[PDB]
Design a protein around this ligand. Structure first.
Ligand SMILES: [Mg+2]
Ligand SMILES: [Mg+2]
Ligand SMILES: [Mg+2]
Ligand SMILES: [Mg+2]
Lengths: 424, 424, 424, 424
């Protein structure tokens, strides 16, 4: 019954106003599903390749070639397959491209199809997406890791740390956790007026105030948590995405808060912040190929704090395996578009989970109205999601979808809360 | 649509000819599913309680009280629930019993319903059981851990080790792995005739030859592997279930091969066998509450060999958590009937997998024609199953079901093979 | 509507771990049915031929050639036929083979299809298999003839009689009859410990104790019946399968309990046991082509005791006709795989029933999880089944299926009990 | 699905213009079936009781009380039952009447319902009636036993033998057998004109010529067979229904061809005719309670000729059992209305078939347009039917239905031919 009958794509805009791919899949039983592909502002070196058109149109970021690839080549390869055979469909897509990085049809063309197929299979089975992907034990609502203040390559300030997140770990439920996050984001606006700092927003929906650096930024978020009537750490803890590749010079070191520092010095710095602040997680504290520094840092602070690989793993099973052997990080950031299929995303989660590593499902800078990642975070029981500040519908659509999943689960829902961060 | 409409149970016989519970669930959409409950010959102290009738009938092992509980109390609690809400159904069963060990309605009455509901939900979604429970990424065929020679409480011999298993890790596919296992079991019969040793079978379908002890038994299996044209270790490795509670005296020590030994001495013994034999796994090397010995042994040999907790964990999240904190074992044996629900089984797998621990899905001595555990092993991607020697349909029905799942997965199937045992 | 649309086979394992054929049939109305083929350890000379692959694989017992025959030749001959036309389908299979013994496609390839078609027709009619084959008057639950102690070619002992069965004839219902059988099998284990005799199992799930011979074996079973609180004969009677071909030399005589004896002497021996023991049935008391001895023996004791032809008839209408004319035996053992189709099985039953002969539906040494024979025994109202000891799911699956049929029939069920053996 | 929803009866006329019962049954799935009850001109003492109204209407033979019983009592007892549970339905009817002979609601009210239910179940299963009752092996077309010349209580002539039948045993198919029967009946009319004998018809559609007696009558039928171009015996054999109760005086003897004779003398007479004429069957050669004579006669000629019990058995399992023990007759006449249910009819067939006895399905003098008995004769593989001369649609409707069943069976049809009468 859930036989793929039709596949079409169109060019749409992402939350930053740049083009991205949207796919629709129709099954012979009348099932219709739609999936949209996110896009990162700055991409890892090792991510799957997005096909972009080049030329004058949309500053060269058009995706009419990806749309044409879905119609000319991918559609004809998957019509007649069963939508339930996700692995067969993703294999057919990977084999049809024939490149390691999906540079021929584009990670953007292939992921659209992989996701739309998974959605059509779940509709066909009459199961919500989280249940279809995760089975009947998918019930864990994740701690929302909300980026309410920006630095690094996301601003023109003194702050080299890219994202400052709040984590409402002490909340009893996801519905309360979301409210705590909202009320801290609103308090932080009011505190930014109090100090004459800018309340202008950036791409991920958080603030970019021109502050001294890392500790200044943390101090303001602590204020905001207290302003909201919540206790820092016990109620709302903190996390960073250093995105340290962005302030790394190839062969050279970490140009960080007006000094060049070694992997080991960055480590000293981070251990500093652990002592002074309620930190549950630090993502990309060192750069995408700094294999020895990462190993050193994990060994130094990995018992004290979740260490998350983003750019170093790019959701890539080959790269995560290298890090697990090397004792590199204790968590994986999961970005479906880094790898290009749902199948390869879940193989990477499996390697992580079976390996002792936690997962954090992540948005991209360039998001869509698509909420698949809220379903995915519950499906894999990550207990953690990074999908933005509680402002901008490309962020809030995910939180709204988590409210809906929590409601659907009833007394079966469990909020990960402090059990996501047992090192804290 | 998949609303529970009717629930009935009956008394049937298990593979040992003792009574057990069979449940049927009908949904309002016409879906009908049947599940049978296995039973262990010797049970752990901490396992969920089976309701048995007592009295003259079937040596007191009747289950007409469990059948009556399904009709009088459980049926009325779950009619009207949705079969897809496994967690809601299992919660309703656990709340209705109201005991920690399921001593009021019986782990046997509750598990029948939990399993039959999961089967009816999968039929209703039109998904094979492994896909419904594991999602579209369920594709790993497990290494069959085949018990071809018995000792301990399963014989009256000098052999204190309970089960001697072959593991066809070097096979390219599950279909070949099964054949390798069969051909080694058949070769071992012929080798047992050659030495005038008995070829009479026991409960798990393997041999119980009266041999010197552990090393004698290993030597005969090595012969059999070679007799089959396979290389010990590279093609067919070995595993034990010591079931060391069976030769443990409370407060006293391990009465093992004509000596009382300490946890540490047992450890010396096991490290001995690692050096001399291609061992991938040892299960219950020490007793169900020997928390300090287990920790010591894991630390000593856990890097060299999978260490499996059976009786020490009884598939119980509270007990597995205690072992993970204490650094006790690196794998969990998964026996649905030890805990009493599918929900609590998957919570225990989740704790294991997320914790770095491997899983091995297990049969019970008293099995049925039911093949749910073949589906479960693929659903959770355990990469390992312990469901008997390749003789007796209560064992072979599971292997036959794994052939069927492999065939259904097509080029999406992956055989766990040597990737199940990275320490070897 | 019940038009055969698809036919596929696969290689699976039987209860002895040797390969056998499994067939699936799909009808255009969405009906899906599965049937598995049993296999005998030692076969009659005149049985339908099993195709086996030869070569190294599985000791030459592979059935990939039978699987290929189902896909290459049988499938194409029966797609488009109506599943309800069993006789047309079986004729098409017999004509396509074109041999008298089914040596071209294999009795194993043809029976799989014949059985799977009958199952799909019954599902399509929405009738349980026993009702579809036997009509609305199929309601007689058979006396289970349970082989709890082995001799002959099934052991290396002094006992030349192959099977010693208990028959719970005085039971009020099949559910009680099964319990009586179980409780006698369990009592007999305990009595075998008491005498230091082995409790190791053989292929049919019974014991093979090294005892003096026939009378010794009977004495132990009588003890076991009494140990269970039942009266020998009135509650639990006895039956033998001598399988006398196994101890016959072509042209020479019956090498039986350390003497060569004539057909007439064997007869004297059997008449001896009738006098001393509550015997309801003796199967193959003389060899497969000893036409004159059989006639002599039937005339001598046929009024005192059921005499069953197994190897002499091989469920073959041509051979049963020869025996009915010659006054040879008063019952037929019915083994679907001896003849190769359901149609030819029922033609043989018809000849038997219309001829005054009773029928006993039989398992094979190599069984599957398939329970078709429980349905067949009720469908033809045999009042007698031989499907093993009440241990091993390849045996117990049949007894469990008889419990289910009894339950489905309600107050319409009748237990054959002592009305199966009017000579006793 | 095939749940009995509605049951209604009406009064209709039989082939003799007397009232009889017609029943309709509707199932909740929309299945509608109609059955009519035959009636015998002269009934056996032991037959099930027909309810008749008494009074002026239709000479007291009205059945409005039977119609009222179906609406007032039987309908309410069987609405809600499953039509497939024939045994449960027939039991409910037998229990509701509560008499041994069905004298409270009438064998006529109960049989209508039993038959209409069986028809509705077969429609619901989408199986022709013969296949639903007999299973997929129902394929034997019976030899038509055609009564072309009447005597006894069916005429006012010198002929005490009630029915003279032709049996086209040497025909290759039922379609040819029917034609042979027709052509002999037509030839016999022409031969009756040649001798100035009457060609006026009686109730069973045959001739009643005023001839000398038995041998005269046989001689005329032989002529007719030859006149048709067929060989007596090899092509068309003979059978009688003596109906000897009709010429028996209680305690006294057999007033037969102008003499009072003993059971033994009747026997001498019959053995006489065997020597002189190609006789395959003689029905009721002695009276309904002449148990010792019947036994004597069977022993004398039973090896030479089928001996059929009609009035002595009345299709009654209790009475057939008495005859089988006493060695009384070798065949049973099967008249559904003698017993009152389909279930009890098939129990009687089962006892017969399993007992070495043949069956002959029979019409009644008072028949309807109903053809159920053609289906029943194939369903039970009787190989013999007695349903009249090949004239009158109450007779020919059955033959026409056998043509239809033969056509539907295709190359699966087998004509019983000479295999119905192995003694000839
Ligand atoms: Mg990042
Ligand atoms: Mg164990
Ligand atoms: Mg035999
Ligand atoms: Mg008559």
């Amino acid at each position: 019954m859930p036989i793929i009958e039709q596949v079409r794509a169109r060019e749409i805009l992402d939350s930053r106003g740049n083009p991205t791919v949207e796919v629709e899949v129709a099954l012979i039983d009348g099932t219709f599903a739609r999936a949209a592909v996110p896009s990162g502002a700055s991409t890892g070196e090792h991510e799957a390749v997005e096909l972009r058109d080049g030329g004058d149109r949309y500053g060269g970021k058009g995706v009419q070639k990806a749309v044409q690839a879905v119609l000319d080549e991918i559609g004809p390869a998957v019509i007649g397959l069963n939508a339930d055979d996700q692995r067969l469909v993703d294999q057919a897509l990977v084999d049809l491209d024939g490149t390691p990085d999906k540079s021929r049809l584009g990670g953007n063309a292939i992921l659209g199809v992989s996701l739309a197929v998974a959605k059509a299979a779940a509709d066909s089975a009459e199961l919500p997406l989280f249940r279809y992907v995760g089975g009947p034990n998918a019930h864990i609502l994740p701690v929302p890791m909300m980026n309410i203040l920006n630095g690094g390559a996301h601003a023109d300030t003194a702050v080299d740390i890219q994202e400052f997140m709040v984590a409402p770990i002490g909340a009893p439920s996801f519905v309360e956790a979301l409210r705590w996050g909202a009320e801290v984001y609103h308090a932080l606006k009011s505190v930014l007026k109090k100090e004459g700092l800018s309340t202008g927003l950036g791409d991920a929906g958080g603030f970019a105030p021109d502050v001294a650096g890392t500790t200044a930024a943390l101090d303001l978020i602590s204020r905001a948590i207290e302003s909201a009537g919540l206790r820092p750490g016990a109620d709302v803890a903190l996390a960073l995405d250093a995105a340290a590749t962005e302030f790394f010079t190839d062969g050279t070191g970490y140009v960080f808060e007006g000094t060049t520092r070694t992997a080991d010095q960055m480590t000293e710095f981070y251990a500093g912040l652990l002592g002074a602040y309620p930190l549950v997680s630090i993502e990309d504290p060192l750069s995408e190929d700094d294999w020895d520094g990462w190993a050193a840092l994990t060994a130094s602070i990995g018992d004290r704090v979740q260490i998350v690989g983003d750019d170093i793993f790019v959701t890539n099973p080959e790269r995560l395996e290298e890090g697990i052997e090397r004792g590199v990080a204790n968590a994986l950031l999961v970005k479906v578009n880094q790898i290009g299929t749902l199948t390869e995303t879940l193989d990477a989660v499996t390697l992580a989970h079976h390996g002792g590593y936690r997962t954090m499902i992540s948005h991209r800078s360039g998001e869509t109205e698509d909420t698949m990642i809220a379903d995915l975070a519950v499906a894999i029981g990550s207990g953690q999601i990074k999908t933005g500040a509680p402002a901008r519908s490309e962020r809030v659509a995910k939180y709204n979808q988590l409210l809906r999943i929590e409601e659907a689960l009833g007394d079966a829902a469990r909020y990960a809360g402090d059990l996501a961060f047992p090192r804290f």
